[PDB]
Structures are given as structure tokens and as C-alpha cells.
Amino acid sequence: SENLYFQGSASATCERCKGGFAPAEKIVNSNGELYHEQCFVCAQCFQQFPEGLFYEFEGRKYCEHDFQMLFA
Amino acid sequence: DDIFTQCREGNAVAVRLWLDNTENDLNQGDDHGFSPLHWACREGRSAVVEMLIMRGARINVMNRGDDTPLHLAASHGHRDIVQKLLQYKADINAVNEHGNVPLHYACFWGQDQVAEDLVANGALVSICNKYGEMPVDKAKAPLRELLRERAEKMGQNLNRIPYKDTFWK
Ligand SMILES: [Zn+2]
Ligand SMILES: [Zn+2]
Fold this sequence. Notes:
Chain A: Within the IPP (ILK-PINCH-PARVIN) complex, binds to F-actin, promoting F-actin bundling, a process required to generate force for actin cytoskeleton reorganization and subsequent dynamic cell adhesion events such as cell spreading and migration. The complex is a heterodimer of chains A (72) and B (169). Chain A is mainly β and 72 residues long.
């Protein structure tokens, strides 16, 4: 995923929380999905994914540790 | 197909029959420590949740990540189940392995009515998790401001409380 500084459409919304972005806001693009920095995080610990690596379970994204503890 | 799947899917008759056999352990967790009650709460299976509680299921059981059924009901926005768990004395400020309480998840996932219900029942808004984040600070701004206001009117102290437990220091 990549860090972007938002200057896009006013219709653009966060994939996680559905909220909008402000001009020049530092956001994250992961596989074409846009996120607030506080939203591109593990659903269980709310922390950034180490090395950007996440694992999906039923529509939510998890860090390795939490995926292994709960779902693997 | 086992008890865990029946609880996830809401197969109430199967769950009832399984519970009828007292040789079965209604508290026993699956491979990741999810008890029948964890699964029923997570998936919104109200009738199964009530059955398990009334037949004596332990309310504060923890899975592998130390989530309780209340954490799961709150995270997935199951308002009636949250109320039922609270009625039967679930620990409203139960902490998981990250020091997150149910309110953290209600806030993070914008489960506004669950979040408000939690605060109405005394859920602490100012208690940091292990990484210094208070539950209300996981919410979007409207909800965040609201819950602090509601907490204040409920006689909470709004001073930030750094995480502590018996093994922390
Ligand atoms: Zn967001
Ligand atoms: Zn995590």
C-alpha cells in the first residue's frame, strides 16, 4: 500500500469507515481502496500492519498476530 | 458440523438438544477458545444467546485473544445481545490481550446505539488500551463528542487513564 496526499473527488470515501477526506490529508491506498491512516489498521488491535501485511477474515483485516490468535 | 457451527448459524433446536446432554461442556472453547456463547454473540443469534445464559453458561469466558462474548456482541453491533449480557452481569470493562474493552469495538465500528447503551450502563470512556488509546477516541467525531458528553452527565471522571494490569510493571 501507498501513502497519498488527498486531492481527489468529494465523493471519495474510506473503505473501512465510509467517511470522507480533507484536501491534503495523508491517506492510504491499498489495492485501490482508500483509507484514513487511522483506518488502515488491524481490526483487532487497531495498530498499523507490520510490513503492510494483513489477513482477511469475513470482511475485516487483521495483522498476522491477531489472525493467528483468532482465525488461522 | 459441531456445536460451534450450530451456534454460529443459529440452529436453535440443535443447540438445545446438545445442551440437554449434560455430558457436554457448554463452556468449552473451540480451537481458538470461542465458546458456544462467543459464537452466538458474535453472529447475533439472540435466542441461542438467551438459551445458553439461562442454562448456566459462564458470561465472562475468554477466547485466545481474551475477548469475551460482550466484546464480540459490541464489535458486531448486536444491541439486544449486549443488553442481555449486561442484564446477566457481564463485565462491561473486560479487557482483551490488547487492553481493549467492548466500548473500543463499538466505537471503532460505529455501532453508535451499542456504544451509547454501554455508556448508559457505566462503561468507562477514558481507559486506555495497552497502546494508549481510549475507547471513545476510536470513534468518528460525532460519536466521540457525544459519548464524552454522556459519560460526563453519568458522573464519569474524564481524566485519561494509562493502561495498567497486575503484570504490566
Ligand atoms: Zn476511515
Ligand atoms: Zn492486530
